[PDB]
Amino acid sequence: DAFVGTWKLVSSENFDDYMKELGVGFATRKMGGMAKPNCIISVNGDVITIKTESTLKNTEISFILGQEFDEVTADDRKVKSTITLDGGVLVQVQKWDGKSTTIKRKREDDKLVVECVMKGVTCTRVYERA
Ligand SMILES: CCCCCCCCCCCCCC(=O)O
Ligand SMILES: Nc1cc2ccccc2cn1
Numbered sequence: 001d002a003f004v005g006t007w008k009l010v011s012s013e014n015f016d017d018y019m020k021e022l023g024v025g026f027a028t029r030k031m032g033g034m035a036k037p038n039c040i041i042s043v044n045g046d047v048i049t050i051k052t053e054s055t056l057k058n059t060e061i062s063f064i065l066g067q068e069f070d071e072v073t074a075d076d077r078k079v080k081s082t083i084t085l086d087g088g089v090l091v092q093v094q095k096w097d098g099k100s101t102t103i104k105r106k107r108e109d110d111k112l113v114v115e116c117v118m119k120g121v122t123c124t125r126v127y128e129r130a
Contacts, residue, residue: 037054048062080095
C-alpha cells in the first residue's frame, strides 16, 4: 500500500534512550545505534511481512492485522505483539512482563516514519525508498 517497498534508514533520533528504556545492554546498544537497516514490507492477502536486514542482525515478522502473535525481537525479548491499522498508521504494540512498547509506522510524503515509545522516551526513525 503506502507501506510496501524496500526502505533504508536515513535518520534516527533518541534510539539509544529508547533501547536503554527497553533494558538493552551497552554492547547491544552500541551495535544497534549505528546500524542503518533496510526494512522490506510486503503484503500477500491477509498477511503482512516486515523484514529488517542489517549487517549484524536480521529479523522478520509475518502477521495478520488484529491477531496477536509471539515475536522474538532484535534484542531477544519474547513478546506478544499485535498490529492494527489506525487512520493509515500501522500501530504495533509489544507486551512482555507487564510492560509495553508501541511502534507506529506511517507514510509521510516520500518517507516511512517510525515512532517508538517506551515509558517517557520517544524515538523517531525515518526511512527512504532504496
Ligand atoms: C543486535 C542488535 C539489536 C538492535 C536493538 C534493537 C532493539 C529493538 C527496537 C527495534 C525498534 C524498531 C524500529 C524500526 O523499525 O526502525
Ligand atoms: N533486525 C533488526 C536489526 C536492527 C538493527 C539496528 C536497529 C534496529 C534493528 C531492528 N531489527
